[PDB]
């Protein structure tokens, strides 16, 4: 009956960003930043030239919401703007409606996680008595930051094992390099295996319950049984990363840890982790 397009102004002038969806495919979407105007037209196309399409109003919505997967039906919208475009009447000919939302809050970066998702979109709705004709276009929001020593974590016992890992920053942007060093300062026990991991922790807190998902993003191994130092370089640009997301509207958190891991000859596991704040640098 009807075909609804949402078209942005300066479509071919504005930037698109890649974003992975719940499936796993990466699509490109219109990138937007906090505050920016969202504006364009809702375009209607009459499939049958020769046919009235009656309705109870046409409207465009800008929505920013958090969707918790353990409660999939119950969306938590943190920004909702509503502009009505037509009163109940009827469409007798393909036409379009201008809309503009000046000053659109977008406080948080789009995120497509394991137990949670945060998205922004425009929703055009043609109300009808039977079934509403509804069209959604997702857009992507990014949050840019801007920032400015040495950080150490260590592992082991008290007299037989002391390993020290040092690295340049407590904060890194998504294209940075983690530059550090492993110091074998005490090794009275044979080390069977050792690695540095970058781990993503998603923490989603749906009602009385919280959910936790760890994802090992990067795993850098330390070789051969002759434990001196060893320089470390982790190239962040290699890996799918998002900025740190902390207590987003108290629904979820995405945080990143350096995970130092060490297995001795008795097979004992030694762990230590420290949080690194990731941020997004503006191209």
Description of the structure:
Belongs to the VPS26 family. InterPro entries: Arrestin-like_C, Vps26-related. One of its GO terms (biological process) is cellular response to type II interferon. It is found in: Cytoplasm; Membrane; Early endosome; Late endosome. One of its GO terms (cellular component) is cytosol. With 283 residues, the protein is mainly β. It has two domains: 1-146, Immunoglobulin-like, CATH 2.60.40; 147-283, Immunoglobulin-like, CATH 2.60.40.640. 0% of the residues lie in helices and 60% in strands. The chain has no helices and 22 strands. The chain has strands at residues 2-8, 16-20, 26-32, 38-46, 53-55, 58-68, 76-86, 89-91, 95-101, 111-112, 116-126, 133-141, 151-155, 161-167, 171-173, 177-187, 191-204, 211-222, 231-235, 245-248, 252-264, 269-279. The strands form five sheets. Strands 2, 3, 6, 7, 10, 11 and 12 form a seven-stranded mixed sheet that branches. Strands 15, 17, 18, 20, 21 and 22 form a six-stranded mixed sheet that branches. The protein is elongated. The two termini are 44 Å apart.
End-to-end C-alpha gap? 44 Å
Indicate how many domains the architecture comprises.
2
The helicity comes to under 10%
Biggest sheet character: 7 strands, mixed
Global structural class: mainly beta
Number of strands: 22
The backbone outline, from C-alpha atoms, is: elongated
User: Counting H and I runs of at least 4 residues, what is the number of helices?
Assistant: 0
What would you say the CATH architecture of the largest domain is? Answer: Sandwich
**Which CATH class of the largest domain applies here?**
Mainly Beta
SSE order, as H and E? EEEEEEEEEEEEEEEEEEEEEE
| CATH topology descriptor of the largest domain | Immunoglobulin-like
Query: What is the strand content?
Result: over 45%
Roughly how many Å is the radius of gyration? 25 Å
